[PDB]
Amino acid sequence: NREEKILNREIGFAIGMPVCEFDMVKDPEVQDFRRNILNVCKEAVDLRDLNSPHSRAMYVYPPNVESSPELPKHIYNKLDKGQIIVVIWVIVSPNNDKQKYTLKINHDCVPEQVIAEAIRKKTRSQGKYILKVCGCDEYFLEKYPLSQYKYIRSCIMLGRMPNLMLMAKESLYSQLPMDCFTMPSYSRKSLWVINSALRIKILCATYVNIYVRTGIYHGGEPLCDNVNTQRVPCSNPRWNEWLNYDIYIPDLPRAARLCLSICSVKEEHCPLAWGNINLFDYTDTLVSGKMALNLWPVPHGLEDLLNPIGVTGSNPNKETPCLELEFDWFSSVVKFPDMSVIEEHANWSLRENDKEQLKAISTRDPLSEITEQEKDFLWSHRHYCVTIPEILPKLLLSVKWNSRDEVAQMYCLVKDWPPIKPEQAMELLDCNYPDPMVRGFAVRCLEKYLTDDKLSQYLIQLVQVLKYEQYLDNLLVRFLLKKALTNQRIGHFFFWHLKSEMHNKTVSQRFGLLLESYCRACGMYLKHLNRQVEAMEKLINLTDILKQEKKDETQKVQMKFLVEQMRRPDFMDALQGFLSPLNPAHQLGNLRLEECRIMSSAKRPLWLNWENPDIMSELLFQNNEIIFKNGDDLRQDMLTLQIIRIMENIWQNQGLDLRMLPYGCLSIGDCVGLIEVVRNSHTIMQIQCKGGLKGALQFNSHTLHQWLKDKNKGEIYDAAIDLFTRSCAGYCVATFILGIGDRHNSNIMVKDDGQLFHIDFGHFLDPFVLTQDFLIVISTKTREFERFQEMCYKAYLAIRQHANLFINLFSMMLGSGMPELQSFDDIAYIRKTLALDKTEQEALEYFMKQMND
Ligand SMILES: */C=C/C(=O)N1CCC(C(=O)N(C)CC(=O)N2CCN(c3nc(-c4cnc(N)nc4C(F)F)nc(N4CCOCC4)n3)CC2)CC1
Numbered sequence: 139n140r141e142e143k144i145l146n147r148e149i150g151f152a153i154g155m156p157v158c159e160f161d162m163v164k165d166p167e168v169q170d171f172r173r174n175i176l177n178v179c180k181e182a183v184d185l186r187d188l189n190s191p192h193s194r195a196m197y198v199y200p201p202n203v204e205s206s207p208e209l210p211k212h213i214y215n216k217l218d219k220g221q222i223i224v225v226i227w228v229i230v231s232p233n234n235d236k237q238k239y240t241l242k243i244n245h246d247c248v249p250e251q252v253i254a255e256a257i258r259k260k261t262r263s264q265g266k267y268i269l270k271v272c273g274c275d276e277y278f279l280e281k282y283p284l285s286q287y288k289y290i291r292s293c294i295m296l297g298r299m300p301n302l303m304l305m306a307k308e309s310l311y312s313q314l315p316m317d318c319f320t321m322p323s324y325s326r327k328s329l330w331v332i333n334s335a336l337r338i339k340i341l342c343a344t345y346v347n348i349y350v351r352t353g354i355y356h357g358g359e360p361l362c363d364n365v366n367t368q369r370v371p372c373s374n375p376r377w378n379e380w381l382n383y384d385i386y387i388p389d390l391p392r393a394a395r396l397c398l399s400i401c402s403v404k405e406e407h408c409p410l411a412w413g414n415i416n417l418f419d420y421t422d423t424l425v426s427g428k429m430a431l432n433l434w435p436v437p438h439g440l441e442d443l444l445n446p447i448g449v450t451g452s453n454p455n456k457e458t459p460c461l462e463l464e465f466d467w468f469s470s471v472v473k474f475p476d477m478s479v480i481e482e483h484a485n486w487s488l489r490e491n492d493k494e495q496l497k498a499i500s501t502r503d504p505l506s507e508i509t510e511q512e513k514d515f516l517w518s519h520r521h522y523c524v525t526i527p528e529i530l531p532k533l534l535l536s537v538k539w540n541s542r543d544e545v546a547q548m549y550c551l552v553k554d555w556p557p558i559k560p561e562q563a564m565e566l567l568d569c570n571y572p573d574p575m576v577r578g579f580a581v582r583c584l585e586k587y588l589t590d591d592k593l594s595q596y597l598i599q600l601v602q603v604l605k606y607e608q609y610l611d612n613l614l615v616r617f618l619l620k621k622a623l624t625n626q627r628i629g630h631f632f633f634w635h636l637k638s639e640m641h642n643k644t645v646s647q648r649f650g651l652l653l654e655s656y657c658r659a660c661g662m663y664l665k666h667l668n669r670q671v672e673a674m675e676k677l678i679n680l681t682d683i684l685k686q687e688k689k690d691e692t693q694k695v696q697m698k699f700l701v702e703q704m705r706r707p708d709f710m711d712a713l714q715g716f717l718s719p720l721n722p723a724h725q726l727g728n729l730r731l732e733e734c735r736i737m738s739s740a741k742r743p744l745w746l747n748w749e750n751p752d753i754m755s756e757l758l759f760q761n762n763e764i765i766f767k768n769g770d771d772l773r774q775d776m777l778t779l780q781i782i783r784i785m786e787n788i789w790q791n792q793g794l795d796l797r798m799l800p801y802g803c804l805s806i807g808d809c810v811g812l813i814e815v816v817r818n819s820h821t822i823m824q825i826q827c828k829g830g831l832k833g834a835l836q837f838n839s840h841t842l843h844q845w846l847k848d849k850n851k852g853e854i855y856d857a858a859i860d861l862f863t864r865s866c867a868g869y870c871v872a873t874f875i876l877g878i879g880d881r882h883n884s885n886i887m888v889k890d891d892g893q894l895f896h897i898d899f900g901h902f903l904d905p906f907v908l909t910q911d912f913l914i915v916i917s918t919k920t921r922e923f924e925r926f927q928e929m930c931y932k933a934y935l936a937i938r939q940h941a942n943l944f945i946n947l948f949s950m951m952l953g954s955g956m957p958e959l960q961s962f963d964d965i966a967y968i969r970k971t972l973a974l975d976k977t978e979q980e981a982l983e984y985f986m987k988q989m990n991d
Pocket residue numbers: 737739743765767771772775801813814815816817819821823824827884897898899
């Protein structure tokens with residue numbers, strides 16, 4: 139049909155690769171995934187059309203709200219007797235005259251009550267309206283308490299006054315397209331019985347320019363010793379050898395994998411090409427017969443001669459080392475047993491001090507190692523551990539995954555295991571836990587106890603752990619896809635986190651198929667995503683040209699070329715009138731070329747400035763600024779900003795107001811990304827160079843206080859000083875805990891109201907100087923510094939209390955090929971700085987001493 143072809147073209151443009159390539163993939167799992175994944179799209183679409191236009195309106199404009207409606211003590215104290223002052227705006231005439239109406243209402247009021255009181259205040263001179271945020275496309279469409287909306291709570295925290303616009307509901311529903319998801323055109327035995335040992339024949343290898351080292355693994359742990367084949371000259375890469383393993387065939391867990399590599403010898407063993415295969419396919423069948431596997435190049439800094447944590451599947455580039463293998467073939471097709479046989483074989487197969495010992499064990503952090511004695515101890519008490527559920531990760535770690543009996547008994551324990559918090563459920567999804575039942579339990583916990591707010595807060599870690607999935611079709615991907623197809627706020631960053639790694643051929647297939655399904659079921663938003671993709675395409679083209687053709691020209695010549703190329707209507711049409719990838723609720727209209735510029739600095743970053751076309755853009759920001767950087771990796775920055783936002787949330791919900799600044803930052807491709815521009819912000823180096831005594835003079839650090847006092851005179855002085863002190867202490871603790879890279883006068887920034895923050899997080903996990911500027915702004919021996927030290931200590935304790943969450947986040951991000959995060963050894967730095975193995979008072983003294991230096 140026509141709709142099908144146009145949708146295919148658009149999806150190909152959005153994903154980067156054409157849809158037709160997926161069809162030419164003669165892989166049963168690929169086509170079965172493409173087909174079976176459409177049930178999730180159907181569920182999501184039905185949920186969208188479930189309740190007339192309101193359901194679609196919630197799908198496109200979901201409420202941006204906090205997970206808990208309860209306000210912290212200090213946040214509630216900032217209210218006028220538990221009330222809030224809110225300005226509601228109304229556009230009246232064809233001239234669009236804007237009339238404001240100020241109200242003082244209970245913070246816990248519903249948007250309906252807000253609209254009612256607004257109409258009351260307006261008439262002193264029915265439910266057919268809704269509330270929009272003045273300046274962006276955010277809508278208060280749900281019966282939430284107003285204060286629970288992130289915008290309202292932010293206004294309450296920042297002292298700013300919320301400005302909302304009243305909008306007829308029909309005016310918004312008329313802007314909602316009648317979406318029509320069209321179903322694609324590509325839609326319409328023994329068991330364990332075999333008793334023996336696993337053996338595999340390595341036949342030969344092609345495209346080799348030595349021996350083959352193999353092993354059987356379950357996630358990261360080997361189910362048996364590794365096996366080296368006969369050292370053969372590379373001229374004739376023919377082994378035809380049979381490798382036998384100390385593993386009974388039925389003893390193989392469901393997620394057993396074969397990890398192989400080709401090594402050379404000088405004495406000096408060095409890997410050449412690696413590969414991993416699923417012993418069981420997606421249909422639970424045990425692979426048999428001949429199989430050709432194209433290997434992958436080795437990643438940098440590989441400790442061993444094997445890469446088990448690497449992705450599974452043959453290399454898409456078939457012009458690579460190809461190893462031929464042979465698996466035993468028995469009577470009939472072998473399948474993994476059903477859960478019923480598992481339960482049958484499981485059924486067939488205590489002191490107070492010891493209970494408190496189990497509790498203390500559960501209290502420990504993830505990276506803390508568990509001894510063999512402790513493993514057998516947890517296993518002997520596997521039934522009592524159901525009363526303390528959060529010990530489930532360590533219990534799983536204590537299992538002998540090379541014994542079908544223990545695996546079946548653990549399956550039984552999991553089938554009825556109590557649910558645990560999402561923060562703890564994510565730990566069971568990293569590379570350590572590949573078992574399908576454990577991952578299903580974790581996904582159930584997420585589905586049951588994860589707010590979409592918390593989902594967006596951890597969306598990147600989940601999209602990453604996706605790579606740890608043994609098969610294309612699994613419960614985790616289905617959950618993520620359903621949430622992305624029922625919530626466009628989540629779907630935006632879902633699509634972008636996926637597209638930002640389409641360059642990686644290791645997950646090109648998986649993420650490509652997932653993006654195909656998403657774009658097929660996402661709706662009209664595919665058009666806006668395509669416009670954003672084309673804008674980023676033009677930006678990448680321009681910045682690539684700048685870094686090579688005109689790379690060694692002067693600032694003004696590069697600027698002249700950038701102004702020339704930024705016009706060329708084919709480019710203006712592409713970079714004008716689209717949604718901000720950093721925040722799709724932000725419209726970006728016409729470019730203010732007079733305000734765009736190359737940032738100098740490193741790798742020629744682009745500083746772009748758009749006008750805000752919002753009807754009431756002046757009440758939020760009339761100009762939106764963004765830094766498009768094509769050069770260095772931004773994943774580290776994304777993770778750091780996420781962690782900083784989480785730390786600020788912890789501090790707020792715990793009762794210490796340390797205003798951080800986790801500005802927007804989105805990696806959109808291979809080292810190509812965007813950065814949010816914080817208005818009215820300048821670097822300390824700027825403060826010193828602008829306040830330099832003269833053109834030829836020294837740049838003392840004492841002036842910063844003078845600059846702040848000039849920018850804040852009168853009663854605003856103490857407020858600015860308090861803001862500076864609090865934000866400074868917060869960033870002190872953050873940078874110490876995370877081990878952020880070298881700070882200096884230009885890595886730090888301050889705003890006109892005193893807020894301090896950081897930028898450009900180069901390397902972490904491998905001493906905040908507190909230049910006498912900061913100490914002078916805080917006031918060494920003053921009550922101000924006493925309160926400062928108290929703040930720092932309290933924040934350090936608060937973060938030590940969530941060390942577990944932070945370590946789990948890092949262990950989940952391990953999958954991403956980031957430099958400063960390649961092994962658990964890098965994460966151990968946090969276990970160090972937080973003194974996990976020490977006590978609370980010990981860690982307090984440790985941090986006191988560390989900050990004394
Ligand atoms: C003093 C005499 C002298 O020699 N000079 C010349 C140099 C001048 C100077 O110090 N400049 C120009 C520094 C400066 O103004 N900027 C602009 C802001 N930049 C910035 N960088 C980033 C960022 C964050 N993370 C990463 N991974 N990369 C970058 C980027 F650098 F690539 N983010 C921001 N912002 C975030 C907050 O809101 C605003 C935008 N800004 C740094 C260099 C002085 C006179």
